[PDB]
Design an enzyme around this catalytic site. Structure first.
Site, PDB file in Angstrom:
ATOM      1  N   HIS A  68       0.791  -1.184   0.040  1.00  0.00           N
ATOM      2  CA  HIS A  68      -0.082   0.034  -0.049  1.00  0.00           C
ATOM      3  C   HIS A  68       0.729   1.257  -0.061  1.00  0.00           C
ATOM      4  O   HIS A  68       0.367   2.238  -0.466  1.00  0.00           O
ATOM      5  CB  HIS A  68      -1.032  -0.038   0.962  1.00  0.00           C
ATOM      6  CG  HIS A  68      -0.723   0.234   2.404  1.00  0.00           C
ATOM      7  ND1 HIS A  68      -0.223  -1.140   3.195  1.00  0.00           N
ATOM      8  CD2 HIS A  68      -0.414   1.097   3.267  1.00  0.00           C
ATOM      9  CE1 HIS A  68       0.136  -0.441   4.523  1.00  0.00           C
ATOM     10  NE2 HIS A  68       0.013   0.773   4.374  1.00  0.00           N
ATOM     11  N   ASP A 125       0.190  -7.808   0.994  1.00  0.00           N
ATOM     12  CA  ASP A 125       0.464  -6.572   0.954  1.00  0.00           C
ATOM     13  C   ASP A 125       2.000  -6.178   1.527  1.00  0.00           C
ATOM     14  O   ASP A 125       2.395  -5.509   1.902  1.00  0.00           O
ATOM     15  CB  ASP A 125      -0.535  -5.730   2.326  1.00  0.00           C
ATOM     16  CG  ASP A 125      -0.093  -4.123   2.444  1.00  0.00           C
ATOM     17  OD1 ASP A 125       0.144  -3.939   1.402  1.00  0.00           O
ATOM     18  OD2 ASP A 125      -0.437  -3.628   3.284  1.00  0.00           O
ATOM     19  N   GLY A 128       3.556   7.028   9.428  1.00  0.00           N
ATOM     20  CA  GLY A 128       4.789   7.086   8.780  1.00  0.00           C
ATOM     21  C   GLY A 128       5.672   5.785   9.057  1.00  0.00           C
ATOM     22  O   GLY A 128       6.717   5.562   8.455  1.00  0.00           O
TER      23      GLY A 128
END
Ligand SMILES: [Cl-]
Ligand SMILES: [Cl-]
Ligand SMILES: [Cl-]
Ligand SMILES: [Cl-]
Ligand SMILES: [Cl-]
Ligand SMILES: [Cl-]
Ligand SMILES: [Cl-]
Ligand SMILES: [Zn+2]
Lengths: 17, 191
Positions: free
Chosen positions: B68, B92, B148
């Site tokens: 992602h 992912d 982050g």
């Protein structure tokens, strides 16, 4: 509880305003 | 453009510190050219595209991160853009061959449930493994604190890799647990 994705804006220290 | 290394986290009791390596302009330019001549150090890279930033963790000579974040993108490198070696959309998970100079973690084989998550701000926070791909934060933090950090490492007490951080499980802006890709899925992705 729900899934949150933890991308930040671009750069090493992303600019927020 | 390419994913660009813009900083790194260096791991030592587990401690960590971060160092910036690129500014915003050099980041955007390096994204377009795919050419990054900087020396790489550390186990965790802070990485960025033109639009978003996150973490990548090097385990057994592969730099892993979240789909992602990175999508199908190349990683900027010394000889030009590096194509993904592994691309597993369902889990992912993406990986590039680690830049020389990155220091690899080795996978955890001890099976400890006492873990540490290393965040984008180089804080090392306790996690209790709760199953294959979930750990509870022993001290809940605002989700802002984990922003982050996608792609960052979960470590066992011996500093070996247990997984990479994928998503936070949150109620009312407070992260109570983390969802992660287990190091096993990296092995399954590879072989
Ligand atoms: Cl900057
Ligand atoms: Cl730069
Ligand atoms: Cl060159
Ligand atoms: Cl360069
Ligand atoms: Cl992007
Ligand atoms: Cl993409
Ligand atoms: Cl928050
Ligand atoms: Zn271990």
């Amino acid at each position: 509880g729900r899934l949150v994705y933890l991308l930040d804006g671009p750069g090493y220290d992303p600019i927020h305003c | 453009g390419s994913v660009v290394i813009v900083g790194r986290i260096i791991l030592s009791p587990i401690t960590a510190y971060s160092q910036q390596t690129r500014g915003l302009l050099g980041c955007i330019i390096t994204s377009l050219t795919g050419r990054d001549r900087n020396q790489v150090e550390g186990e965790v890279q802070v990485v960025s595209t033109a639009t978003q930033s996150f973490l990548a963790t090097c385990v057994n000579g592969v730099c892993w991160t979240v789909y992602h974040g990175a999508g199908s993108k190349t990683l900027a490198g010394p000889k030009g853009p590096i194509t993904q070696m592994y691309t597993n959309v369902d889990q992912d998970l993406v990986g590039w061959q680690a830049p020389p100079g990155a220091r690899s973690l080795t996978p955890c084989t001890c099976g400890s449930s006492d873990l540490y998550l290393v965040t984008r701000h180089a804080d090392v926070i306790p996690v209790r493994r709760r199953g294959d791909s979930r750990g509870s934060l022993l001290s809940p933090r605002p989700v802002s604190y984990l922003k982050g950090s996608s792609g960052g490492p979960l470590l066992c007490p011996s500093g070996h890799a247990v997984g990479i951080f994928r998503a936070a499980v949150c109620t009312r802006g407070v992260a109570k647990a983390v969802d992660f890709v287990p190091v096993e899925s990296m092995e399954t992705t590879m072989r």
